[PDB]
């Protein structure tokens, strides 16, 4: 729930502001977990070197890079196969630091998403700066935490968690009611965990 | 910090008890993150279909399986390449349910660990029951949470979190002082997060 700003407004933020660019790669998923639970969509995130879940991407120094080229530089290191353009640009948000966080997002086919996972495990940053990709489970199991709420209970780069829920909403992959519900089950799971 | 019990004591627990078997695959890692931070060891865990971090493995029905064969059944589905024996058996612990959790652990070479990651992304359960492998960062960064404490802040299968810290200790991959320290930085990070 960051403050959204227009693309052109973000580009007037220069030296005072650092810029980050991240990629949300996702695919329609017709499969069913256990033959029973529709998966609907699969979204890629990653375990970062700092032990947090985030999106592929990183900080882009505008002294040296366009946002596109700087993003693809980092995607080349950590995913090693795909390149995004301004066609995929989705949002800019304001955030310790003054950072404008840009989100790019692209719908892939499910096998294209799998190809990204296969190239990631051979990438230059795999095992160093990137410690593995994970798929976001977007379903919720019968106990009401299995799946997406449990997943939201992990530790994120805060801007990544905000961007994921923002994108799921504006891309109409999940209604905002269900996002608020899942976030609420996660936070209460977390508070119920802190009882020891 | 589960109650440890002897192998033979666990085998006297039959029908009243469910049994789980998990694999801790790890490797000495001579590399340095950013050229600066010794990585020491790499441990494999995975994002499970329920949105929690855990170890490769699962529940083993002793009506049908030995613990070894049942473990390798699940490893075959989710990792697709390696098989463990009783030579790798490390511990049994008592835990909603009456479960004896058995931990197997094997030191691999770093490239053998990478081969496991490559076979996992082609496995039968990848994208369904297993949503991706991740490496555990065992270093701590200068801010005292980057790396291992942040990683411990994620959401685990509780038995998996206990088994990881138990194994790091008894395998002498990390002194217990440092484990308690990292767990303490994680829990306080979590509590400081629940302020919103």
């Amino acid at each position: 729930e960051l403050k959204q700003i227009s693309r052109v407004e973000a580009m007037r933020l220069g030296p005072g502001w650092s810029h980050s660019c991240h990629a949300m790669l996702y695919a329609a998923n017709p499969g069913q977990l256990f033959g029973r639970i529709p998966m609907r969509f699969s979204v890629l995130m990653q375990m970062r070197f700092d032990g947090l879940l985030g999106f592929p991407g990183g900080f882009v120094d505008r002294r040296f890079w366009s946002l596109e080229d700087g993003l693809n530089r980092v995607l080349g290191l950590g995913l090693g196969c795909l390149r995004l353009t301004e066609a995929d640009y989705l949002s800019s948000h304001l955030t310790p630091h003054r950072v404008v966080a840009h989100l790019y997002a692209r719908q892939l086919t499910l096998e294209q998403l799998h190809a990204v996972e296969i190239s990631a495990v051979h990438s230059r940053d795999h095992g160093l700066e990137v410690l593995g990709l994970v798929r976001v489970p977007l379903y919720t199991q019968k106990d009401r935490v299995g799946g997406f709420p449990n997943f939201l209970s992990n530790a994120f780069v805060s801007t990544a968690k905000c961007q994921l829920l923002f994108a799921l909403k504006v891309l109409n992959m999940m209604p905002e009611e269900k996002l608020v519900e899942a976030l609420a089950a996660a936070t209460e799971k977390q508070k119920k965990a802190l009882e020891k | 910090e589960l109650k440890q019990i002897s192998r033979v004591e666990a085998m006297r627990l039959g029908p009243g008890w469910s049994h789980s078997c998990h694999a801790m695959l790890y490797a000495a890692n001579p590399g340095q993150l950013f050229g600066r931070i010794p990585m020491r060891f790499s441990v494999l865990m995975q994002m499970r279909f329920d949105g929690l971090l855990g170890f490769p493995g699962g529940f083993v029905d002793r009506r049908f399986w030995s613990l070894e064969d049942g473990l390798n059944r699940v490893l075959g589905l989710g990792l697709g390449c390696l098989r463990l024996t009783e030579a790798d058996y490390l511990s049994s612990h008592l835990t909603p349910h009456r479960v004896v959790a058995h931990l197997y652990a094997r030191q691999l070479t770093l490239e053998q660990l990478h081969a496991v990651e490559i076979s996992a992304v082609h496995s039968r359960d990848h994208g369904l029951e297993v949503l991706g492998l991740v490496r555990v960062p065992l270093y701590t960064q200068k801010d005292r949470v980057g790396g291992f404490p942040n990683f411990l802040s994620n959401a685990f299968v509780s038995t998996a979190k206990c088994q990881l810290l138990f194994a790091l200790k008894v395998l002498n991959m990390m002194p217990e002082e440092k484990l308690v320290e990292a767990l303490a930085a994680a829990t306080e990070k979590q509590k400081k997060a629940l302020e919103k």
Partner: nanobody
Amino acid sequence: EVQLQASGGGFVQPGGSLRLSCAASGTTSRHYDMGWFRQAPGKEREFVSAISSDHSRIPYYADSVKGRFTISRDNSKNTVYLQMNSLRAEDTATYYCAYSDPYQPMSYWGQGTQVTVSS
């Protein structure tokens, strides 16, 4: 904190040559970018050249220095070099080394080194 240390510069006769060096210390990364800016009399600080540590792309140059300046690196020393040839009066300026990388937000600047081209 990434600290930048620079070497070289000073007085140069027109058409001569001069080589700047710059290294990064501290919380550096493995994949990073380093380059040079300069501020000439009555102008704003302008891009000169940049290079990457990882062959991510080809080093680039300002149009006014193409074919005269060449940037190069030694990532065993985390050091980059600017070889300035066929120096002209237009090249008189304070030159600044820069460092950044994809894994931390800060864009770092070194201290200015004066290059003075004059007969």
